[PDB]
Design a protein around this ligand. Structure first.
Ligand code: MG
Ligand code: MG
Ligand code: MG
Ligand code: MG
Ligand code: MG
Ligand code: MG
Ligand code: MG
Ligand code: MG
Ligand code: MG
Ligand code: MG
Ligand code: MG
Ligand code: MG
Ligand code: MG
Ligand code: MG
Ligand code: MG
Ligand code: MG
Ligand code: MG
Ligand code: MG
Ligand code: MG
Ligand code: MG
Ligand code: MG
Ligand code: MG
Ligand code: MG
Lengths: 129, 150, 141
RNA sequence: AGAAGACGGUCGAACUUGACUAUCUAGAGGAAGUAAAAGUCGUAACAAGGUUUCCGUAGGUGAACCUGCGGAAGGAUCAUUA
RNA sequence: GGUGACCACGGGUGACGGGGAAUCAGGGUUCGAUUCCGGAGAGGGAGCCUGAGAAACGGCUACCACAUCCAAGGAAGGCAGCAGGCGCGCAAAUUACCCACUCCCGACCCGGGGAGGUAGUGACGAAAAAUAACAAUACAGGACUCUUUCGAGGCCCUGUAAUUGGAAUGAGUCCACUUUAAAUCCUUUAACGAGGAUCCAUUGGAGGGCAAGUCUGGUGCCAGCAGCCGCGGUAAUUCCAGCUCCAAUAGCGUAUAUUAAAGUUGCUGCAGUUAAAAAGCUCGUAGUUGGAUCUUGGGAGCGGGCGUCCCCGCCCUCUCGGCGGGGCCCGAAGCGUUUACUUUGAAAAAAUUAGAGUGUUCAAAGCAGGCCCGAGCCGCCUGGAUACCGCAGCUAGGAAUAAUGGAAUAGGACCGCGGUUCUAUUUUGUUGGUUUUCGGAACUGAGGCCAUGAUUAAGAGGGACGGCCGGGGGCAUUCGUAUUGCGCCGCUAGAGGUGAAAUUCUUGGACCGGCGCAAGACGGACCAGAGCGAAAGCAUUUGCCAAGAAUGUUUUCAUUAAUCAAGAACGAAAGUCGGAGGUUCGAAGACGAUCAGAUACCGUCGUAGUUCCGACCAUAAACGAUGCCGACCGGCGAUGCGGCGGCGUUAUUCCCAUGACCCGCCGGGCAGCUUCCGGGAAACCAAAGUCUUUGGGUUCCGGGGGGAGUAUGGUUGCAAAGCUGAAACUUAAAGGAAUUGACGG
């Protein structure tokens, strides 16, 4: 059954991006999905997105700007510390110039650079570059 | 997909987005509650009560009309069965299957379906035990089922 | 596929140590039967006494007589066959000599066209076979 | 004040018997498996391999193998007509 | 009672534990007997004396095993302390000097110390570093240059041979000093000490991998080389040699353990259609994993610049606030759950590692050192850092992610008012009578108030309900022709079988034709890349029994779920046991053919079986050679089921429906065609895709080919056999997909 709504959202976005679709619909919406898409939005990898509100778990329509290479997920939410964050960076990000690792910390959901800036670790959610 | 079948049917109910009571519905909360009370006294399961109510009295959703579910209303007044309806129907089906088997033992298919139904009964009973609906020592037995249901 | 849960480490570790018995190197190094069967008994070299000088036919595509010695190891008293590896060193070898014997090069496996020979002679009568071949020192008469 | 020595108690080496348990090891003879090669008998598999091949099972034969029953195509048919 | 699949108990360990070592993207994999810490032991056990401390062994007692002396009556032992032997082995050093250093013991500045220091052997290993440098002639080379090849020199750089040809030095001899307990060595310094500076560099190689010869001579599939491919049968770039080259160099080769290479153990990070491989199928407990949902927006100058960036300040309560009665303040108690997680701090031996400083002559190292002396410098300036130290435990911040709970038969929260039992203290200061609701704790009743208290109803699941649907299953029933046999009737010499025959049945009527009867099988054609079932499988009619998917649902419960060790149900055919029944077919078997043979293929019979009932067995190329659940990613035409719409045709009737067609849509299926979605070794696959841009959940399972699905042990079975399941040994390939050819009865 569906056990990782974030993983399904990220795979759907990845497939639509590889097909060149201008928009894509993620059927189950979550707060983590909204926050993940928000950090992608702020970095510019996607455009505007809409949260269709049904009285169930809502849906999301995101606009793809065509500048996304991969937006995968790290399904076992590992405990990452500031001492071993850079090993995750080397293992996941294509280069040190660009790319982001998203992790949920007690200060909120953020990317790895902001997490390092405010000196906190957390649980890795996924990555996008 | 289905728990005990290789089927992946999608047939469900699509509740409308508007929780508001229709303007053409004149029944109010207490009237619908008394209608439920008399249907339950007639001896109908909550599913049948909802079906009858929607088919004849024009009520869409009892919860949307009264603020509570049918089982909640029946529990609140005090005329709901101690055995949950779905569990009751499951034991009833198992009783029928076992009664058929004792006369037609060569029905290997019926023995297989009996195993499936018993598994569903035990899983449902486990859930009810954890939710304290059933007593912690409530045991389903192939001998006591016929006495428990009807 | 494989499990990825946050607390599946017991299953992962048990599966690794269960599947590690399925490759030849680990089984050989951790069961002990190969060490028991090894005539050297886990040693790099071993000393023995020459019992007989024998010739072994090479494999099929080649055609030659490889000169070997039947050797009884002074420890554990096992009989092996050791190749005398040079042009005329079998003449340096004679009966009942204390020969040092090493492996042939690939870890208890036959080498080249020589069938079933896993060992080679390094020294004879406590003087190096290479020295005898090069003529650096003569046999102790 | 007191030594030798004695009864009993307790730890208890060591010996004998019996049980269990780990390795190691001899053995008349038997039956396999490899390797060697140049032997003998046939030709079972590869082509429709000259009886299509193979799987499971059972029986039988100098030997590969043969045959019955059900199956597969990895077949020699992706097809056979109102 | 206690402990166990969250692996107890047992067994093994070529297991002392740790700090640490090797390898070195990251992650890891191996090694730690070994100088520091801790433990144990002193031939194996056992028991004790003394002593603060011992179950001490350079203490004692006894036994077991070794072993010393003896006048045979006795007596004496414990080097896994330093040396040194034997033995074992592939494998490891002097029966040396000294308490001078570091420390320890003692009654003690004074003695002792095989602790320890020193030297000896020492290519374990690590650091530095000789074996030559220069100048001038020749003969070459350079953008060389002068005239624009020809000749030379106002230049630069190699190599070859020479009275060259005279400079420089150690390696060694060896005076002295120095070092040191005595010394040795190193460092100094006299004197000798180099022209084959013969004061002599080696170990492995020269086909490929892999740097270097198609040189010469011998051998001739021998000798041998060769880790692997391979070389060698007379001109061998591979053997044996000479020469010449190549690699590293005072070191190089070899054997063996181990690490990288190995993404060939795959957590990061492997595979499972065909290469090795997914259980025959389903249930199911542990285990693992689990949908969405509960505070977000708005504030004040400081402010990563209201400079609409934002250091950032966010515009819990109650008790004396310690600076019986001040606002001039910040201390005492609890959290409006418990964790997981993250950050911080403490505590984490040294050595080792990283690393700071410091010219050890550089370096490995070491923990030292430097400064001015004009000689009085009657001494000054320093260092001996820091980092890391896992997991577990302690502390203080954060509250996103994940689990966990609070009020549903209210036994609910909060404000009080009743009514109930005790008590440190009182001062209604002479004790005594004490009043103490005194202060707060004991039990319990009637109220008010809480907006009084249930998130939604998952393109999750379960259940109900409606109309259907289906070779789904069980029981009963019915029918069909065919086959075989029987009973009659008819005419006839053949009939049967084959490639040809033959065995076989036949003037006793075989074969054939007709009518009946009986039995046992099997349900043709319709019948399909159609349906149903978890698979195995399922096909005459009718009835009965339960079951089921899908579709429809503004019905119900509300996470009840996915996959699953152990355990279980069902499982083609064959096979086993018992009873029925035995028509056809037909293992075995016989016979006839065929053939060189023919134990077969072909034919005539024919046993078990094939059929049913009961009990076993649990295996198939049980196949889609292809786990399940979930999400996404093209197009098209069909088909089965259900539902929803629509021109029309048809069936009946006077009209709608309701059936058969026609055109669509939706959902669940069995599939097909096409596609540069993408993948893959390709064949091919819309899954075998979404995979180095590698992580949705979870189960099983492979690790070169054989040996081998074998041996042994256990377990199941009446048996046949099934399940679980190695090793020795052997081998350089075995395999997969495609291509070209060659061949094909
Ligand atoms: Mg015999
Ligand atoms: Mg054959
Ligand atoms: Mg054949
Ligand atoms: Mg083929
Ligand atoms: Mg040990
Ligand atoms: Mg140690
Ligand atoms: Mg120690
Ligand atoms: Mg004392
Ligand atoms: Mg001791
Ligand atoms: Mg002792
Ligand atoms: Mg020299
Ligand atoms: Mg040579
Ligand atoms: Mg390695
Ligand atoms: Mg592999
Ligand atoms: Mg295969
Ligand atoms: Mg479970
Ligand atoms: Mg969740
Ligand atoms: Mg005939
Ligand atoms: Mg059967
Ligand atoms: Mg029978
Ligand atoms: Mg027959
Ligand atoms: Mg899974
Ligand atoms: Mg293998």
């Amino acid at each position: 059954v569906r056990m990782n709504v974030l993983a399904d959202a990220l795979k759907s976005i990845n497939n639509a991006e590889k097909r060149g679709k201008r928009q894509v619909l993620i059927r189950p919406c979550s707060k983590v999905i909204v926050r993940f898409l928000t950090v992608m939005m702020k970095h510019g990898y996607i455009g505007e997105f809409e949260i269709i509100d049904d009285h169930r778990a809502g849906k999301i329509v995101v606009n793809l700007t065509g500048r996304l290479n991969k937006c995968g997920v790290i399904s076992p939410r590992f405990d990452v510390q500031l001492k071993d964050l850079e090993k995750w960076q080397n293992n996941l990000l294509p280069s040190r110039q660009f790319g982001f690792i998203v992790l949920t910390t007690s200060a909120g959901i953020m990317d790895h650079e902001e997490a390092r800036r405010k000196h906190t670790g957390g649980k890795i959610l996924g990555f996008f570059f | 997909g289905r728990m005990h079948a290789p089927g992946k049917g999608l047939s469900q109910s699509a509740l409308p987005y508007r929780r508001s009571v229709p303007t053409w519905l004149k029944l109010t909360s207490d009237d619908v509650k008394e209608q439920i009370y008399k249907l339950a006294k007639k001896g109908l399961t909550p599913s049948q009560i909802g079906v009858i109510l929607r088919d004849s009295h024009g009520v869409a959703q009892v919860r949307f009309v009264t603020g509570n579910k049918i089982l909640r209303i029946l529990k609140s007044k005090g005329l709901a069965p101690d055995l949950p309806e779905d569990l009751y129907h499951l034991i009833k089906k198992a009783v029928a299957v076992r009664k058929h088997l004792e006369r037609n033992r060569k029905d290997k298919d019926a023995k297989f379906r009996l195993i499936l139904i018993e598994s569903r009964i035990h899983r449902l009973a486990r859930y009810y035990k954890t939710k304290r609906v059933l007593p912690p020592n409530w045991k389903y037995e192939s001998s006591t089922a016929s006495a428990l249901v009807a | 596929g494989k499990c990825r849960g946050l607390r599946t480490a017991r299953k992962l570790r048990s599966h690794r140590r269960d599947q590690k018995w399925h490759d030849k190197q680990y089984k050989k190094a951790h069961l002990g039967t190969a060490l028991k069967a090894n005539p050297f008994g886990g040693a790099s070299h071993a000393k023995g006494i020459v019992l007989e000088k024998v010739g072994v036919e090479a494999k099929q595509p080649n055609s030659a007589i490889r000169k070997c010695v039947r050797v009884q190891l002074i420890k554990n008293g096992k009989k092996i066959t050791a190749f005398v590896p040079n042009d005329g060193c079998l003449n340096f070898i004679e009966e009942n000599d204390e020969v040092l014997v090493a492996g042939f090069g690939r870890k208890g496996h036959a080498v080249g066209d020589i069938p079933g020979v896993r060992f080679k002679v390094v020294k004879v009568a406590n003087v190096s076979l290479l020295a005898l071949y090069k003529g650096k020192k003569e046999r102790p008469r």
